[PDB]
Each structure stands twice: as C-alpha cells, then as structure tokens.
Design a protein around this ligand. Structure first.
Ligand SMILES: C[n+]1cc2c3c(ccc2c2ccc4cc5c(cc4c21)OCO5)OCO3
Lengths: 264, 8
C-alpha cells in the first residue's frame, strides 16, 4: 500500500534487480571468493595495457589518460541506464510527468553514481570492468593533469561515506531519496515530488533506527552526505568543463552532454 | 531527448 514496509521492500528489490554491482558483491570480490582468479590489479601502464588487451580487444595512438577517460564515460552511461530502470520501479515515479522524470534523473544520476561508487572503493583503489579490474588509488593520482584530479575527490568522499558502514538496503533507500528531490531546478509538480521524498526519508529514518541501533546520529549524518554529494557534482561538472575545452580527443558522450547542459 | 528515450 502507501505502507512504508512495501516501499522499502519494493525499493530494495528494484535496487538488487537493476544494479550489476553492489556492496555485498563488492565485498565478496575483494575477499577473493567470487572467481578462481581475483581482480586484475592495474597499478602501472604495463598492467593497464594487459587489462585493456583482454577485457575489450576493440586506440593506441590516443593517450593513456584519454582512454581511461573514455572508460569513466562508458561506466556513467551504463549506470545512468540502470538508474533510469531503478527510478521507474520507485512507487510514484512512473506516475510523474515525463518532463519531471527527465529533471529528477538529470540532476539525480551523478549524486547517485558517486554515492554507489563508494561500494566499490577502499583506501587503496576501486573495482572496474564489471568487477574484473582493480585500478589503484595511487596510479590514478600519478596521471598527467588534469585527468589525475577526477577520482581523488570521490575517494575522499567514499572513505568517510564507507565509515558509516551502511548496507545495500540502507543504500537503496538513500539512492531513492537522491532521485526524488523536490528542489531540482525546472521541476513543475514540486508538491507531489516533496510528498514522495517525505515518505522515502521517513522509511529511511525508520530503517536506520532498527538496522543501526548503535549509531543514533546516523540519519542526520546521511542527510548531510546528500548536501555533500550535491557539491561533489558541481566541482566535478566544473572539472569536466575544463577538459571539454582544453582537450581535443575527449568529446563527451552525447547522453552525458544532455545531463551536464544548463546543470550548475 | 536521449533522456526522454531511456524513460521509454
Ligand atoms: C574503458 N573500459 C570500459 C569498460 C566498460 C565496461 C567493461 C569493461 C571496460 C574496460 C575494461 C578494460 C579497459 C582497459 C583499458 C581502458 C579501458 C578499459 C575498459 O583504457 C586503457 O586500458 O562496461 C562499460 O564500460
């Protein structure tokens, strides 16, 4: 019904159905019990080249950074597609105007991507290529600017975000709250999105009480992480501009073009 | 418009 029990369940099931990666799977690959052979460590150009050779095997006149940048974009386009299906399964979202749906996703998706990125990041680096690769934090810092400056903010954010020790049920509700935000610029039917968000945040508060009884201040810590994401995005949008202007072989994918247009 | 399309 309008019941928060069926709201949480439907959101957790839409989360499991629609995202290829999640925290449980991430933790399993990083312990080395997912496959016969663990993720391929990418720490230098040597290993980055082995990795590209085996997992893609089509782009060797284009610079290393430009190729890595192409990959970031491919991953966003995929996750944007997963997020759109996830969104479509959120009670109430289907019944919105198409123009409101476009808005909520336009501004929602990068907050959601960076929030979920945290699940595949440890202090040392991150899982890539559907769980088959591990690119080191350091190797990324040791790229030529301005490309070495992309991920570092996301690791900073994820290190603190992961310390909250949330599980996938907690994260499902958190992504739902990011998408159903009543103050996106352009929103027509604000009052119906505010009521939708009020419900998700409410069941999120209730979910955190029962699931995380120790941490009594966890709910206000998560509301602040949503502000923090909104500002991680603006800084990243800005850094992607610098790259569009000052870099030739880095034409943005057309879907990400639309998303970034008129953004912030 | 590519975003319209995904919500198909
Ligand atoms: C750029 N990419 C995108 C991927 C991707 C996938 C799965 C795997 C990859 C991948 C795997 C190895 C790679 C190795 C590379 C590389 C890029 C990739 C790479 O650039 C240089 O060496 O689903 C969506 O998008």
């Amino acid at each position: 019904t309008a019941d928060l029990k069926s709201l949480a369940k439907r959101i957790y099931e839409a989360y499991l159905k629609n995202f290829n990666m999640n925290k449980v799977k991430a933790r399993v690959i990083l312990s080395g019990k997912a496959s016969n052979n663990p993720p391929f460590v990418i720490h230098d150009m040597e290993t980055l080249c082995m990795a590209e050779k085996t997992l893609v095997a089509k782009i060797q006149n284009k610079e290393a950074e430009v190729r890595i940048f192409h990959c970031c974009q491919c991953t966003s386009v995929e996750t944007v597609t997963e997020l759109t299906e996830f969104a479509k399964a959120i009670p109430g979202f289907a019944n919105l105007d198409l123009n409101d749906q476009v808005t909520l996703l336009k501004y929602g998706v990068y907050e959601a991507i960076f929030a979920m990125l945290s699940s595949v990041m440890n202090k040392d680096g991150m899982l890539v290529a559907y769980g088959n690769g591990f690119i080191t934090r350091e190797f990324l810092k040791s790229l030529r600017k301005p490309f070495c400056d992309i991920m570092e903010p996301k690791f900073d954010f994820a290190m603190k975000f992961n310390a909250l020790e949330l599980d996938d049920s907690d994260i499902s509700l958190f992504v739902a709250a990011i998408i159903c935000c009543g103050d996106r610029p352009g929103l027509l039917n604000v009052g119906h999105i505010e009521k939708m968000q009020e419900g998700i945040v409410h069941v999120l508060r209730l979910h955190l009480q029962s699931n995380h009884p120790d941490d009594i201040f966890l709910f206000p810590k998560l509301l602040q992480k949503m502000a923090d994401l909104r500002q991680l995005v603006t800084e990243h949008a800005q850094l992607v501009q610098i790259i569009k202007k000052t870099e030739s072989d880095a034409a943005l994918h057309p879907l990400l073009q639309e998303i970034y247009r008129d953004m912030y | 418009k590519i975003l319209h399309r995904l919500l198909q």
